[PDB]
Design a protein around this ligand. Structure first.
Ligand SMILES: Cc1ccncc1-c1cccc2c(N)c(C(N)=O)nnc12
Length: 270
C-alpha cells in the first residue's frame, strides 16, 4: 500500500482475538491478518523500547527465516504505540509449557526441544546474529509442539536500565557467563552459555536456575567456577552437552554447529 515499505504492515489489516501473554514490552495478542492468517501482535508498551533503532533493525530481521525461528512478519510504525507482528505460537512460552506437569514428557521430547532451539541458534550463528537473551522465556511452542526461538536481539532496544545493567535488578544473571557478569563481554560464546542454561531449564521442567540463590549469590558462585548440576531427567550424555556450554574459557565452548551434531548423536544413541 501507498504509505508502506516491505517491512510495514497496515494495522487496519488486523483483527484482535485474545491475549496471549506479556513480558518486557507489555502485552502480546492473537489476531488475524486480512481475516485469514494467524498472527501474534506484540503491542509495544509506550516508553519501553528504542523504537527508531528497532525499526531499522527490523529491516534486517525480515530477512532472517528458519523453520525453528519465530518469523517476523512486519511492523506497524505509523503510530507510536507500535506493533510487532510475528508467527503465531498457539502453545505459548516454553517456560510455562515445561511447568505444566500434565504433559508428562518423555526425555526424547525434551531432547527434541533442545534440537529445535539448537537449529534456530546455528542458523542465527551462521548469520553472525546474537540472540543476546536466550532462555526458556524467549522460546515458544506451536500447536504441533515444535519449539521456536523468539525475540532474538530485542534486548538491544530495552529502555529500562534494570534489564540492561549487569547489576540491574532485571538483568538475566542466571543465563550469563562470567565474562558478561564481570566485564560485559557479549559474544557467540555468551549465546552458547545461555543455551546450556536453557537445556538445563528444559531437563529441569522449567525450574529456575540456581533456585536457592539470589542473583548476587549466583554471580559469585559462577565467578568461582561452580555450575548448575545434572537435572534428574538428563542422561550422562545430555548432561555432558549442557556442561560443555559452561567452560570458564569462552573459546573452549562449542559452536551451535558442534552442539547440534552432539545432540543428534545422543538422539541416535538414546
Ligand atoms: C515470548 C515472549 C517474549 C516477550 N513478551 C511476550 C512473550 C510471549 C508470552 C506468552 C506467549 C507468547 C506468544 N504466544 C507469542 C506468539 N508469537 O504466539 N509470542 N510471545 C509470547
Amino acid at each position: 500500500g501507498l504509505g508502506y515499505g516491505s517491512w510495514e504492515i497496515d494495522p487496519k489489516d488486523l483483527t484482535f482475538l485474545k491475549e496471549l501473554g506479556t513480558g518486557q514490552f507489555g502485552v502480546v495478542k492473537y489476531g488475524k491478518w486480512r481475516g485469514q492468517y494467524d498472527v501474534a501482535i506484540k503491542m509495544i508498551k509506550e516508553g519501553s523500547m528504542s523504537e527508531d533503532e528497532f525499526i531499522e533493525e527490523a529491516k534486517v530481521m525480515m530477512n532472517l527465516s528458519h523453520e525453528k525461528l519465530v518469523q517476523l512478519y512486519g511492523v506497524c510504525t505509523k503510530q507510536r504505540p507500535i506493533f510487532i507482528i510475528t508467527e503465531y505460537m498457539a502453545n505459548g512460552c516454553l517456560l510455562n509449557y515445561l511447568r505444566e506437569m500434565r504433559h508428562r514428557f518423555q526425555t526424547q521430547q525434551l531432547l527434541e526441544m533442545c534440537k529445535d532451539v539448537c537449529e534456530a541458534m546455528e542458523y542465527l550463528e551462521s548469520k553472525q546474529f546474537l540472540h543476546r537473551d536466550l532462555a526458556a522465556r524467549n522460546c515458544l511452542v506451536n500447536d504441533q509442539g515444535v519449539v521456536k526461538v523468539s525475540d532474538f536481539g530485542l534486548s538491544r532496544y530495552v529502555l529500562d536500565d534494570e534489564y540492561t545493567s549487569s547489576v540491574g535488578s532485571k538483568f538475566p544473571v542466571r543465563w550469563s557467563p562470567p565474562e558478561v557478569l564481570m566485564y560485559s563481554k557479549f559474544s557467540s560464546k555468551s549465546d552458547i552459555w545461555a543455551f546450556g542454561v536453557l537445556m538445563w531449564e528444559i531437563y529441569s521442567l522449567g525450574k529456575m536456575p540456581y533456585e536457592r540463590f539470589t542473583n548476587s549469590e549466583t554471580a559469585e558462585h559462577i565467578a568461582q567456577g561452580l555450575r548448575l548440576y545434572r537435572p534428574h531427567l538428563a542422561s550422562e550424555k545430555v548432561y555432558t552437552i549442557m556442561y560443555s556450554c559452561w567452560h570458564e574459557k569462552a573459546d573452549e565452548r562449542p559452536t551451535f554447529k558442534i552442539l547440534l551434531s552432539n545432540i543428534l548423536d545422543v538422539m541416535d544413541e538414546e
